[PDB]
Structure formats: C-alpha cells, structure tokens
Amino acid sequence: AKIGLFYGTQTGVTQTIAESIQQEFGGESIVDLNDIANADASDLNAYDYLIIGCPTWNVGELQSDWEGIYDDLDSVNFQGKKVAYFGAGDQVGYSDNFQNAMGILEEKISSLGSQTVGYWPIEGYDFNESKAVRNNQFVGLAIDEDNQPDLTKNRIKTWVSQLKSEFGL
C-alpha cells in the first residue's frame, strides 16, 4: 500500500488503535499494518508515507519492541518521507511522562531527515510534562484509553481526516 503503519504494543491497546486508523483510511488497499516486533529497519524504506505507533511504558520509556529496533533506525534514509505518529498513554497515572515514547521516536526519525505531519492540540488533555510536545502541540495523535476511552473514536476520525490532506489522499 501507499502508507506503511508500524506499531509496537505490550497489552494490545496500540494494535487496536492501529486497526482503527487503517479502517478509517479505507482498509488494506490504502494502509499496510506492520508489527514492529516482526520487522527489520529496512522495511521502513519501502514507503514514502509512514505512520508510527508506540505506547509509553515504564515511566517515560519506549515499548520494548521499538526499543529493540531503535539503534537500527540510523541505517534508513528518511529524507523525503512524511511521517505521522500516534501513541497510547495514561495522563493521570504518568502526568510527567505522558506520551514520551511518541516524542522519543519523532525526535529520532526527524533527525534522520523526515518531515513530521499530524500535529495535534494539547488542550483536550491534562498532564504536566511530555517529551512529545513541541511549541504547544503534540507531534502526533495522543490516545488515552485508560482515562478517555469515550474520545478515542472521534479523535481517530478527526486525525485521519487531517492526515488524508497531508498524504495526498
């Protein structure tokens, strides 16, 4: 497909979100779903449009599967690629490390020459600190199933609608 979605997940929440995003875009013919646990860094090279999903774990850390491939990311040339990010987190329980994984990955991938698209407003959340915030916006979609599951469906619909414009759909 045109868009490659790569996600990592520990308790399955990020996978469910990935599946909803693929569905909102139009299905398998538009978005390829890939579990980063089963991929090689070079698989990211096959796409010009990428969506990266990762939940934050263990107080500000990357989900372990993303942690595993992190050092290999240097071998991929992201210049010219448009990359969007999404993450699952818990704003109440980890108010000072909310969605940090998403920010760690964005800082790394953009330093390799990619363009970040998909900024999201921070006003619909209550947290103290997040490494995924730059100039008062999140660098990608923040989902919180632990505290705001009622908002997930419309957050995804709205985000995907905005991304379509960025990805030329």
Ligand SMILES: Cc1cc2nc3c(=O)[nH]c(=O)nc-3n(C[C@H](O)[C@H](O)[C@H](O)COP(=O)(O)O)c2cc1C
């Ligand atoms: C042990 C543990 C640590 C967590 N640490 C963080 C954290 O530092 N920041 C955050 O935003 N959420 C944190 N969370 C919340 C998870 O990211 C959240 O539950 C998410 O839905 C997990 O998605 P997964 O099922 O895709 O792995 C933590 C949850 C647990 C159980």
